[PDB]
Amino acid sequence: PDGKLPFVLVPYMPRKRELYGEADAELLGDNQKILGATMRGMIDLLGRSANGQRAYPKGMLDTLNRRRFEDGLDYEYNPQTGNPSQAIIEHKFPELPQSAIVMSQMQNQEAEALTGVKAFAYGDVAAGIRGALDAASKREMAILRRLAKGMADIGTKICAMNAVFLSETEVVRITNEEYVTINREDLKGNFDIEVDINTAEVDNQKSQDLGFMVQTIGNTVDQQVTLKLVARIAELKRMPELAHELRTWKPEPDPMEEQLKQLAIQKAQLENQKLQSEIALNEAKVRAEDAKKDMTN
Amino acid sequence: INTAEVDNQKSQDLGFMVQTIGNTVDQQVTLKLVARIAELKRMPELAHELRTWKPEPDPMEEQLKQLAIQKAQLENQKLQSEIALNEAKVRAEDAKKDMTN
Amino acid sequence: TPVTWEDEQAARQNELVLNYQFRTQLNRVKLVDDYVHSVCDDGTGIARVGWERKVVKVKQDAPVFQMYPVETEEQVQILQQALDLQAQNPRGYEEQVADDVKEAVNYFNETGEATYAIQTGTTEVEVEKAVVNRPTVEMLDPNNVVIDPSCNGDLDRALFAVVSFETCKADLLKTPDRYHNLDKIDWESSSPLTDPDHESKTPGDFQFRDAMRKRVIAYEYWGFWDTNGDGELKPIVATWIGTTLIRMEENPYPDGKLPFVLVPYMPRKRELYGEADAELLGDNQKILGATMRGMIDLLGRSAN
Amino acid sequence: TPVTWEDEQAARQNELVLNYQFRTQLNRVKLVDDYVHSVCDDGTGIARVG
Amino acid sequence: TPVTWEDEQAARQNELVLNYQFRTQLNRVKLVDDYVHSVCDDGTGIARVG
Numbered sequence: 001p002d003g004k005l006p007f008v009l010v011p012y013m014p015r016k017r018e019l020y021g022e023a024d025a026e027l028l029g030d031n032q033k034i035l036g037a038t039m040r041g042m043i044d045l046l047g048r049s050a051n052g053q054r055a056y057p058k059g060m061l062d063t064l065n066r067r068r069f070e071d072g073l074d075y076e077y078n079p080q081t082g083n084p085s086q087a088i089i090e091h092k093f094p095e096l097p098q099s100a101i102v103m104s105q106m107q108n109q110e111a112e113a114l115t116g117v118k119a120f121a122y123g124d125v126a127a128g129i130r131g132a133l134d135a136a137s138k139r140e141m142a143i144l145r146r147l148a149k150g151m152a153d154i155g156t157k158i159c160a161m162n163a164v165f166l167s168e169t170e171v172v173r174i175t176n177e178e179y180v181t182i183n184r185e186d187l188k189g190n191f192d193i194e195v196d197i198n199t200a201e202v203d204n205q206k207s208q209d210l211g212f213m214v215q216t217i218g219n220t221v222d223q224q225v226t227l228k229l230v231a232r233i234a235e236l237k238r239m240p241e242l243a244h245e246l247r248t249w250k251p252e253p254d255p256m257e258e259q260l261k262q263l264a265i266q267k268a269q270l271e272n273q274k275l276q277s278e279i280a281l282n283e284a285k286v287r288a289e290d291a292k293k294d295m296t297n
Numbered sequence: 298i299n300t301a302e303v304d305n306q307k308s309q310d311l312g313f314m315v316q317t318i319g320n321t322v323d324q325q326v327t328l329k330l331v332a333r334i335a336e337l338k339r340m341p342e343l344a345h346e347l348r349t350w351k352p353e354p355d356p357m358e359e360q361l362k363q364l365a366i367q368k369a370q371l372e373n374q375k376l377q378s379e380i381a382l383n384e385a386k387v388r389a390e391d392a393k394k395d396m397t398n
Numbered sequence: 399t400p401v402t403w404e405d406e407q408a409a410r411q412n413e414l415v416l417n418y419q420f421r422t423q424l425n426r427v428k429l430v431d432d433y434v435h436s437v438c439d440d441g442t443g444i445a446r447v448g449w450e451r452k453v454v455k456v457k458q459d460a461p462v463f464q465m466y467p468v469e470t471e472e473q474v475q476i477l478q479q480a481l482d483l484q485a486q487n488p489r490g491y492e493e494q495v496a497d498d499v500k501e502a503v504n505y506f507n508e509t510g511e512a513t514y515a516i517q518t519g520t521t522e523v524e525v526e527k528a529v530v531n532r533p534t535v536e537m538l539d540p541n542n543v544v545i546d547p548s549c550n551g552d553l554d555r556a557l558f559a560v561v562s563f564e565t566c567k568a569d570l571l572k573t574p575d576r577y578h579n580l581d582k583i584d585w586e587s588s589s590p591l592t593d594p595d596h597e598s599k600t601p602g603d604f605q606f607r608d609a610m611r612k613r614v615i616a617y618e619y620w621g622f623w624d625t626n627g628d629g630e631l632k633p634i635v636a637t638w639i640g641t642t643l644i645r646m647e648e649n650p651y652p653d654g655k656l657p658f659v660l661v662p663y664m665p666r667k668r669e670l671y672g673e674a675d676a677e678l679l680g681d682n683q684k685i686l687g688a689t690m691r692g693m694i695d696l697l698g699r700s701a702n
Numbered sequence: 703t704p705v706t707w708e709d710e711q712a713a714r715q716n717e718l719v720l721n722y723q724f725r726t727q728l729n730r731v732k733l734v735d736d737y738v739h740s741v742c743d744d745g746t747g748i749a750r751v752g
Numbered sequence: 753t754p755v756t757w758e759d760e761q762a763a764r765q766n767e768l769v770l771n772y773q774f775r776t777q778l779n780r781v782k783l784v785d786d787y788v789h790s791v792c793d794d795g796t797g798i799a800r801v802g
Contacts, residue, residue: 023745052699149731150661157447176756187652192405244757268364275371282378289385296392345403
């Protein structure tokens, strides 16, 4: 109906007066190059070295006095050759130049300034928990949501299968309530059923929402709606008996308090009739006084 | 698109509207707003139980009011009859005064 | 949660049933521990959602009742009480109300005539009870699922998916009149499975000595194939062990889709499979290990 | 949201239908994961609505 | 906890019996001390219920 091309294009970083957009790695060019060329230099410095390569001076330790050395036993060395702590070198890792680290830091800071991205609660959850998510918490949620979508798909696949494989008796035994038939033709749409995983935070927030609803509509609507909401709250609290005791609850009428009201209505009617009789009597007295006045005249 | 923060703020705005217009407008508007709040809370059954809700009238409380109106009318007629009786007594006393004269 | 207002009872029932199947039948603490692990270690979490069924044709003795229309008011009272108990407490009705009044209630619900019953005798009926009727969610190995590579992403639009599993003759005989050609396959050879494509944890030299526990490697072709020849692709299933086909039907599941659910760990742009965590962590472990080994070399190749 | 006051029923219906098509039919967690990714990796996110 | 509303008495009875068998008969402080230990030391905690 819209009469337009069925494509929707959105840029990441817009190009001025241009349909296509410019991605992130455009400004990050040559920063990766410098940082990689410095990390490779540091790794080259570490790996192209000699680690644990003892270098004995030629003449210090004679025969069998080096075999004692290479076996752990105490040895005897010729003093005239040197000192067996500055000679007999134990080559170690070279010391990383401060230039490599400072250049890596400079490139990281420049890239982070170019692109303002510095390095460093599922469901209908409340505001505090949903706003407490800092960096990498939104990244863990990004995987938790895929995992949750998988479980939701499993749940709806099972729920669809339950409608055609479990007989009536099995369901009326599991739930102990009336069996509700679901039409088989519309089972490929999941029209009137939504499925999602449930966590403790979701349960707490749902209980709070039901409490809020009870508070809001508590005096306007009748007792049935509020009682059903409180029964749902009790079901969330894992009290299935209170739910039954609170749903099927008919407030018994009080014989006395009932009557009294009927007698009050009767009293009101009797009072109205009494006033009518009083008006009639007053009119009769007026007529009698008129007759007496005529007689006096 | 709709996010969790949008839902929370919309629920708060509906609550604020209910608070503001809660006693001026009739019950239907407030009930519909609370039903929308309940829909945002993913309770589609409460929405139906709260939208199509007609407050049942109370037979007794109804009558009593009719009897009170009848009582008011009867009282007005009683006062009229009392005025008529007073005028009749005034005429009778005038006749007696004439006879005494 | 219900979508519309009329969907509330159906949603409550479905939730109450599917939260019981996922608690009593499936081990949630193990299923979720092999779900997150198999997603964060491999990259994808292909899981099969099936249905386990064990129909047994048992023969039972069912009382047969002769019906007479209700005359006394006491019978009507009993019928009304049974009807109320059948709607308030179905389980209480099942294990409190006798068989004759049970049949009376069933007749009233069927036709609508209040009628009490008297037992004449007993008949002998079959009754195809399904002993096991539970769903099965099993974490599958990415070496066993061969998903159509043409699905430019979107598993929904994949035309086939071949899955391997270690079944036994007992599993196939659990649900009869579904598997044909079960006699061409060798069942008493005590030969360990030698499939070069299915990777499992069963030791290569393990095989049950008896007949109906022998482990065989059965494939399963879940896909779409036009059956009537009119060009409309209709879902089909197929199972073959070795070289003999043993099953070919339409997709029994109501959704009419492949019974696999795949979730990526870190998604690949416009790609069905996902990229795991150790892809970016490459060469970092190499450098860190090569430095720790250097430090240990420096300490150990010295004289202390 | 409705634009004018008479648009309320139509907006409610359209929202209720299009929030069901985007939940039952399309995989939202995969669509959004290939939307942001294909926008932040390539620069553009051309998507066909058929 | 009961599943449905009619399951309450059965759940109460079962809890009251199985919280007595696990207190009077089995040594809870030793069973749990050989459960967590045998799980964290070996890897698995195979236990027979007879």
